Structure formats: structure tokens, C-alpha cells
Amino acid sequence: MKSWRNVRKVISGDEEIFTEKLINTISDDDAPQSPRVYRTGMSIDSLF
């Protein structure tokens, strides 16, 4: 997003170029809610 946004600000103006539209934008709500169980990046291989 931002690496294209500065190129919006050089070869074009402040209004969004054609290409800033097509890049997706992930909705910041799609986490899995893993912390119903509390685990970490610990190497759990030793357990099994």
C-alpha cells in the first residue's frame, strides 16, 4: 500500500491511481482467536 502510495505522489497526484484500487486490503478482524487456549511459540515437541 505505502510503497505504491508514494509513487502516487510522484507520477500522479494525491487522488488514488488506478493501481491502488486493485491491491487487496485485508479486513483487520479475521484472526482465529487462538487465545481461548494460552500457548506460545514454545517447542511443544518435547511433550509428545
Partner 1 sequence: PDMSIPLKHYVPSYLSRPCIFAQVHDILLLSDEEPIEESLAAVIPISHLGEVGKWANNVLNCTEYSEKKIAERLYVFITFLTDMGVLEKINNLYKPANLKFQKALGLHDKQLTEETVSLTLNEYVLPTVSKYSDKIKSPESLYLLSSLRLLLNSLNALKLINEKSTHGKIDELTYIELSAAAFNGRHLKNIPRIPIFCILYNILTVMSENLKTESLFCGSNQYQYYWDLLVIVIAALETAVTKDEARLRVYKELIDSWIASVKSKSDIEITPFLNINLE
Question: Distance of CA 30 to CAs 6, 26, 33, 34, Å?
Answer: 28, 8, 9, 12
The single residue among 14, 15, 24, 29 that binds partner 1, judged by CB under 8 A, is 24
Binding test (CB under 8 A) with partner 1, winner from 14, 28, 30, 45? 45
Cell numbers standing for residue 43: 517447542
Q: 23, 26, 31, 37: which one contacts partner 1 (CB under 8 A)?
A: 23
Q: Are 30 and 45 in contact (CB under 8 A)?
A: no
Residues that bind partner 1 (CB under 8 A): 2-4, 6-7, 9-11, 17-19, 22-24, 41, 43-45, 48
